[PDB]
Symmetry: C6
C-alpha cells in the first residue's frame, strides 16, 4: 500500500486517457479493494469454523458446507480483482518497456510502434470489460439473487439425519455482497463508456 | 501508513483550500482511522466467540447474535470511512490527471477546465457531507442512543428456552462508540463550515 | 514505522522550538509508543481468555471480567497516545498548508499570519498538556494506586456462588503500568517546562 | 510489495529484451504470485486442522493426512515460484555488479564482457524453462490429473478400522489448481517463444 | 525495517565517532534485535498456554506460572532493547534539531554549542552503559545462572495438591538466553572501550 | 523487504569484489531466506500442537517433544542465517563509516586505511565460512542424516506407559531440510572459491 506507486500503475494513463477512464476506474478499483479487504479479514474471516451444524458425527459439517457453498464469495471477488488488474499492470510494464526502447534509441516506425501501443491499450480495455462481465455471470450462476439463506437442510453423507444448520452472519454478508455487485456494475458501465469515447475519438480523427 | 503519501492524498488541497477544510478534516480523519483501528483489532476483535450464551444446543448462540446484532459497529464505521475517503481520492487522482493533461499541453479553455475542477471539488465536498449525514442516520436507526445492552433475552429457533446472555465488553464499546460519534459530528460541522466559507468566497468574487 | 517521516511529524518544530521541547517530547513519545506496543501485543494480549474463573456456568467469567475491569489499561494508554498525538499532527498539517499558501503567494500581513501560527502552536502545546493531565486523572480514578489485584471475589449474576478468580499476569502488568505512568509524568513535566520557556521568551521579546 | 522495485527486478531487461519476454513473463509471474498468496492465506490456510477424520484414537488423522498428502500443493507452488524467480534476481544482481565494474572503470574487452553477460542471460532463461518443466512434471507425478478426491479410505496404523474421511474444500482447491497450472503452462510457452526469438535474432546477426 | 533509516539512526555518528563505537555497537544491536524477534515470535511465543500443569481445578496453572515466572525473559529483553535504544534516538533527534538551528542561523558561541553536543553524546554513552549493566543485574537477580528448570513443584492456592509440571521448551530457551547474555556482555565491553577511547582522545586534545 | 536496500547491504561489494562472490552469495542468501520463511510460516508453523501423542495424562506430550526434539530445525536455520548475515552488515556499516571519515577529511595514510578495510573484508569472509561450517557440523550432530523419523517410542516421565507417537509432516520437512542443506553447502563452496580467488589476486599483485 503506497500512494505514489498505486497511481503510476492502476491509472493506466498510457498513450492517452479520456478523463472518464483511468481516474474513475482507478477510484472504483480502490474502493473495491478496500471493501474486499474489509469483507475478507472481518466478516467472512475463517468462514469455516463459524458455520456450525447441529450434528455429533464428525465430518458432517465440513462436507455439508462444501455442498451448499462450492466457492466462497470472497474467493470469487479476489479472483475477479486479480483478473481485472492484470491488463492494467500489463499495459504499465508495456509502457515501461516502450520507454526503455525509446531510451535505447536515444543511445515513421516510431509512430507505428506508438499506434500499436494504442491498439494494445484498447484491446486491454476490451479484455477487462469481458472479464468483468464473465465474472458477473459466474457470480449470478453460483448464487441466485443477492440475499443469503439462513437455514439449510443437510442430507449428504455422512450426516445420518436431515439436520438443519445456520450461516455465520447473513445480514453483513448481504450488505457487502450488494456493495461489491454495485461497484462492479458501475465499473462495467464506466468501461463501456470509455470504449464508446475511444470510438468517438477515433472517428473524429478520421 | 506513510507520512508523505497521506498528506498529498487526504488533505485534498486541489484548486483551493480555506485553511478550515483540508487541514482540520484530515486531522479528524486520521483520528477516526486510528480510533477505528484500535477498536477493531482490540476491543471488538473477533466479536463472535466472545458473545457467549447459556445454552447447550449448538447454533443457538450464532443465530441469536445475528438476531440481536444485524451489522456490527466496526463494519459500519469502516464502511463510513471508505465512503467518506472516496471523494478525497477521487479529487486527488482528478488533479493528477489534470496535471498530466497540463504537461501534455506543454509538450480561455484552460480557465474553463480549472473552473470545472473547482466545481468538481465543491460537489465532492457536498457528497462527502451527505455521506456522513446518511451514515449517522443509519447508525441511529440500527442502534438507539449510545449505550450497549448487557443482558439479552433470546427466543429465536433453535433456542428451546428463553435463555439470556451477555455481550463481551459493554463499557469499552460504549466509550469507543461515543468517541466515533463525536468525531463524526465534528467532521460534519467542519464540512458544513467549509461549504459556507466556499459560498462566501464565491459571493466575494461576484 | 519510518525514520524520515516520524521526525518530520512528531517533532513539531513548526515556527520555533526551544530545544527542550520537540526533541525530548518526541523521544518520550517514541518510548511510550514502543512500550505500549510491547505491552499490548505480548503481556495483555487477548486479556480475555487468560482471565479464568472457577465456575462451570457459562457467562459468569465474561460478565465478571467486565465488572472488575471496566476499560483495560491498554485501551486507556492507546487512547491517550492518540489524543496526545493529535495536536502534533494538527500543527504539522497546519505548517504544510501554510507553506502551500506561501508557494501560492510566490506564484505586514505575512508577519501577522506567522504570529497566528505561533499562537496556534502555543495553544496546541497547552491542549496537549491538558490532555495528558486529564488522562492521568482518569487513570487514577479507574484504578487506585499502581499494583494489580491478584484474587477477586465475584458475586455478580449469573455466578451462583461467590467464586474467586485470578488475573493473568499481575507482576508484568504492574511493571508496565509503572513504566507508562513514569513516562507520562516525565512528558507532563517537559510540557510544563516548555510552556514556561515560551513565556520567558515572550517576555524577553517584550 | 513495492511498485518501483518489482519492475526493476522481475522484468530482467538486462542486456536486451524481445518485448515478448520480460513484460509478459513479469505479468504472468505477478499473477501467479497473487493467486498463490490468495490460495495460501485463504483456502488451504492451515490445511491440517480442517482435514478431519471419523476416528476417536488420537494420531490417526495426522498420520493419515501425510499418507494421502505427502507434500501440499501450496508448498510445491511456493517452491516453484522461488526457483523460477532465482535466475531473474541472479541476472539482476549480475547487471548491478556489471554496472559497478563499469563505474570502477570510469574511475574490445568490454564487448567480450557484455557478450558474456548476454550468454548468462540466455542460459538463465533456459534454466528457468527447465525449472518450470520439471516442476510441472513433479506436480503431475504427485497428483494425477487436476480434480481433488473428496472421500478417502484410511487403513494406516494406528487407525484400528478402515475409517473414511473428507478434504476441507475440494472445489475451491480444484479451481485454484486449474488457475495455477494454466498460468504455469502459459509461462512455459512464453519462455519457449522468447528462446526461439533470441535464436532468430542471433541468426539475423550472423 | 528499512536499510537507509536504520543506519542514520542507530549508528549515532553525531559529532564524532571512534570507529570502535557506532559501527560495532550498531552491529551488535541489530543482532540482538533479530535474535529477540526470533525468540519472541517462535520459541517463547504465547508462553502461557504451552506451560501446562497436571491439575484439574481451573486457575491453578495460571497462578502457578506467575509464581514461578514473575516476568518473562522476552519482556526483560525487549525492555532492555528499548531503554538502550533511547539514548541513540535521543542524540539523533538532538543532532537533527542542531542542524535545524544551523539552517535557521544561515537564514565562538557555535563552538560552545558543538561542545555541549559532544558532552551530551558522552553522557548518553555513559547512560547506555549504566542501563546495560543494571539490566544484566536485574536479569541475574530474577533468574540464577542460565539454565532453565524443567520440572517445578507447585503448592500455591488453589492447587489442592503439590502437583508438578513442566516448561514448554527448556533447551531452545537456554540457547537463546545464552545468546542474548553473550551479546549484551559484548555490548557492555564495547561501550566501556568506547568511553576509554573518548577519554584518551580528550587527554590527547589537552 | 526492499529491493534497493537489500542489494546495497547483502552484496557486500565493499573495497573489491570478484564477481564470483557477492552476486552469487547474495543470490543464495536470498534463496535461503525465502525457503526458511516458507518453511517457518507454513510447514513447521507452531510445530508444538501438531505433535500429538497417544496419552491421556497431561504434560507427557510436551516433555516428550523436548526429549526427542531439543532444538527445532527452523531455529537452527534462523540462527545460522543471522550469524552468516552479521559479517555482511558489519562490513556494510564499516564502509559507511569509512565514507563518513572520507567526507570529514574533505571538510599514504589513506592507502593504509583502505588496506585495513580490505583486510577486514577478507577476515569477515573467513569468519562467515567458519560460521557456515560450524553450523553444518552442529546440524549433523543434532540430527543424523536427513530423513525425519515418523514414529517415536516415548518412555520419559510422566508418561506412565511406553506410548508411541507421530511427527506432524515428515515428507515436507524432509524436502525442506534437503533444500536448506544443499543451499548451505553451495554457499560454503562459493565462499571457499571466493577466498581462493582473493589469494590468487593477492599473489598476482605481488
Amino acid at each position: 500500500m503506497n500512494w505514489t506507486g498505486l497511481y503510476t500503475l492502476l491509472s493506466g494513463v498510457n498513450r492517452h486517457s479520456t478523463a472518464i477512464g483511468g481516474v474513475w476506474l482507478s477510484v472504483i478499483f480502490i474502493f473495491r479493494i478496500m471493501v474486499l479487504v474489509v469483507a475478507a479479514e472481518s466478516v467472512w474471516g475463517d468462514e469455516k469454523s463459524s458455520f456450525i451444524c447441529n450434528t455429533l458425527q464428525p465430518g458432517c459439517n465440513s462436507v455439508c458446507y462444501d455442498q451448499f457453498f462450492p466457492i466462497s464469495h470472497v474467493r470469487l471477488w479476489s479472483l475477479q480483482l486479480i483478473l481485472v488488474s492484470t491488463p492494467a499492470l500489463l499495459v504499465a510494464m508495456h509502457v515501461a518497456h516502450q520507454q526503455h526502447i525509446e531510451k535505447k534509441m536515444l543511445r515513421r516506425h516510431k509512430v507505428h510502434i506508438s499506434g500499436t501501443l494504442w491498439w494494445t491499450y484498447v484491446i486491454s480495455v476490451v479484455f477487462r470489460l469481458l472479464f468483468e462481465a464473465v465474472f458477473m455471470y459466474v457470480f449470478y450462476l453460483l448464487y441466485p439473487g443477492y440475499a443469503m439463506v439462513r437455514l439449510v437442510k443437510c442430507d449428504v453423507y455422512p450426516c445420518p439425519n436431515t439436520v438443519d444448520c445456520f450461516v455465520s452472519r447473513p445480514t453483513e454478508k448481504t450488505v457487502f455482497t450488494v456493495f461489491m455487485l454495485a461497484a462492479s456494475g458501475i465499473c462495467i458501465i464506466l468501461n463501456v463508456a470509455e470504449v464508446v469515447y475511444l470510438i468517438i475519438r477515433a472517428c473524429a480523427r478520421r
